[PDB]
Amino acid sequence: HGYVASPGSRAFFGSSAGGNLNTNVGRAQWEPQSIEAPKNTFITGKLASAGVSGFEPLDEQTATRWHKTNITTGPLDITWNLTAQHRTASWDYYITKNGWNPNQPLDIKNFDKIASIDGKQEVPNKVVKQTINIPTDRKGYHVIYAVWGIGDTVNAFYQAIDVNIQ
Ligand SMILES: [Cu+2]
């Protein structure tokens, strides 16, 4: 169990630690760390919730529904906080393509992978800091999809992150 704290994930922003910058987020208000589903679950319109019961409100998609963190292109520091550390296989990051439609359901086919970090089947610290590159053809509102792949289960944790690139 874990979430991306910086830039705050959509779920994290629903919690008091995240400033309640997103409202009406279901279970994310209290447990943004709990978006767990089998690896390679990418159901269109169910990316933000990973299809998990109680997280459905996260799946709404409009240009103005969610709080964005202002960022630039180039290097971006990602910080995870893990409430329950687990042996780790992988960390993968995706971002919406230039030209994507922010008023349509999220579809992984409209994202590119932009980073992949091997967990080496070790147990990470409770705070995990990584640096990824935001491609320079992205401007404005984009969604980063951060995926923590567990090493000793068939599951992963899924974190949609709303950013405004300028
Ligand atoms: Cu866990």
Curated annotation (Swiss-Prot):
Localization in the cell: Secreted
GO molecular function: chitin binding; copper ion binding; monooxygenase activity
Catalysed reactions, semicolon-separated: [(1->4)-N-acetyl-beta-D-glucosaminyl]n+m + reduced acceptor + O2 = [(1->4)-N-acetyl-beta-D-glucosaminyl]m-1-(1->4)-2-(acetylamino)-2-deoxy-D-glucono-1,5-lactone + [(1->4)-N-acetyl-beta-D-glucosaminyl]n + acceptor + H2O
GO biological process: chitin catabolic process; polysaccharide catabolic process
Primary site of residence: secreted
Metal-binding in keyword set: yes
CDD domains from the UniProt entry: LPMO_AA10
InterPro entries, alphabetized: Cellulose/chitin-bd_N, GlcNAc_Chitin_IntDeg, Ig_E-set
Group of enzyme by EC: oxidoreductase
Keywords in alphabetical order: Carbohydrate metabolism, Chitin degradation, Chitin-binding, Copper, Metal-binding, Oxidoreductase, Polysaccharide degradation, Secreted, Signal
Pathway(s) per entry: Glycan degradation; chitin degradation
Coiled coil: none
EC assignment: 1.14.99.53
Limits of the Chitin-binding type-4 domain: 1-163
Cofactor or coenzyme needed: Cu(2+)
Residues that hold Cu cation according to the record: 1, 86
Binding note for cofactor: The copper metal center seems to be reduced from a Cu(II) to Cu(I) oxidation state prior to binding of dioxygen for catalysis.
GO annotation, cellular component aspect: extracellular region
Biological function: Involved in chitin degradation. Catalyzes the oxidative cleavage of glycosidic bonds in both alpha- and beta-chitin via a copper-dependent mechanism, leading to oxidized chitooligosaccharides with a dominance of even-numbered products. Acts synergistically with the chitinase EfChi18A, and combining the two enzymes leads to rapid and complete depolymerization of crystalline chitin, especially with beta-chitin as a substrate. Is likely involved in a chitin degradation pathway that allows E.faecalis V583 to grow on chitin as a carbon source.
UniProt name for this protein: Lytic chitin monooxygenase
Protein species of origin: Enterococcus faecalis (strain ATCC 700802 / V583)
